[PDB]
């Protein structure tokens, strides 16, 4: 039993714990969300298949780590699903050739939000997996640890639904023009969704986000969002109806709006949060 990652990097085997860097592509699925498909990221083989057969199981106590430590879910191991953190030893995977074959493991998370996410930066710990290796000819029976680290920055969805982008940037035409905001949401199964806006406002109507531009800020103006011509105040939930597997636009447009006194020349910037809720 000897393994390497997708880019060909050897995983030092047995003995001390190994730190294994993998690419992940987390997505919502029905009832659980994929965190990482390891089967495209870790490949193993047997250097003596004519005379030795290798067996590997995933041991009890394998679990998420780092920012995912408090989540539970499931592990798909060799085509079958088990609770994760693991509560029993899995069946074995057999390595019976010199040709590399996947380590057939995928990690899933049980949703706890509507459309939330947890950022995982490259270099961060994802999971701690405990493996047990045996064979078909002697008593060798050794257990060792693979610490699975992100090779790439991702946002792991924690809900039933996911968004087109977690960080959206738009630029208004020069005052007084407006700009549509490209932002959509979809769900793994049909869900009834709403959303609300968060941020600092300047006006009696709690609907004009303050201008926080750092350099040469314009005075007397902020940013106001509308959907189909209707102003959306902060902290007032907008309904999206039922969102299915195809993306639904939030329907948002950004506008300038006056906050009082003279409008003066300069830069404008506002940072506005969007939070989804089930309805």
């Amino acid at each position: 039993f000897a393994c390497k990652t997708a880019n060909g990097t050897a995983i030092p085997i047995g003995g001390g714990s190994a730190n294994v860097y993998v690419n992940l592509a987390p997505v919502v699925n029905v009832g659980q969300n994929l965190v990482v498909d390891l089967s495209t990221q870790i490949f193993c083989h047997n250097d003596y298949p004519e005379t030795i057969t290798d067996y590997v199981t995933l041991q009890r106590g394998s679990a998420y780590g780092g920012v995912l430590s408090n989540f539970s879910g499931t592990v798909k191991y060799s085509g079958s699903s088990y609770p994760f953190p693991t509560t029993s030893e899995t069946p074995r995977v057999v390595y019976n050739s010199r040709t590399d074959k996947p380590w057939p493991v995928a990690l899933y998370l049980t949703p706890v939000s509507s459309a939330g996410g947890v950022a995982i930066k490259a270099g961060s710990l994802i999971a701690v997996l405990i493996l047990r290796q045996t064979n078909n000819y002697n008593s060798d029976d050794f257990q060792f640890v693979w610490n699975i680290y992100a090779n790439n920055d991702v946002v792991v969805p924690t809900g039933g639904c996911d968004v087109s982008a977690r960080d959206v940037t738009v630029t208004l035409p020069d005052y007084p023009g407006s700009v549509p905001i490209p932002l959509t949401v979809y769900c793994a199964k049909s869900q009834n969704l709403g959303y609300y806006l968060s941020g600092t406002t300047a006006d009696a109507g709690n609907s004009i986000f303050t201008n926080t531009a750092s350099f040469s800020p314009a005075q007397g103006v902020g940013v106001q969002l509308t959907r189909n011509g209707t102003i959306i105040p902060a902290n007032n939930t907008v309904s999206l109806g039922a969102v299915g597997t195809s993306a639904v636009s939030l329907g948002l447009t950004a506008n300038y709006a006056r906050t009082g006194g003279q409008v003066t020349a300069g830069n404008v910037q506002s940072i506005i949060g969007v939070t989804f809720v089930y309805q």
Partner: peptide, 13 residues
Amino acid sequence: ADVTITVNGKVVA
């Protein structure tokens, strides 16, 4: 929040 929107603009002189 689940998404952050940054809106930039300008009032020209």
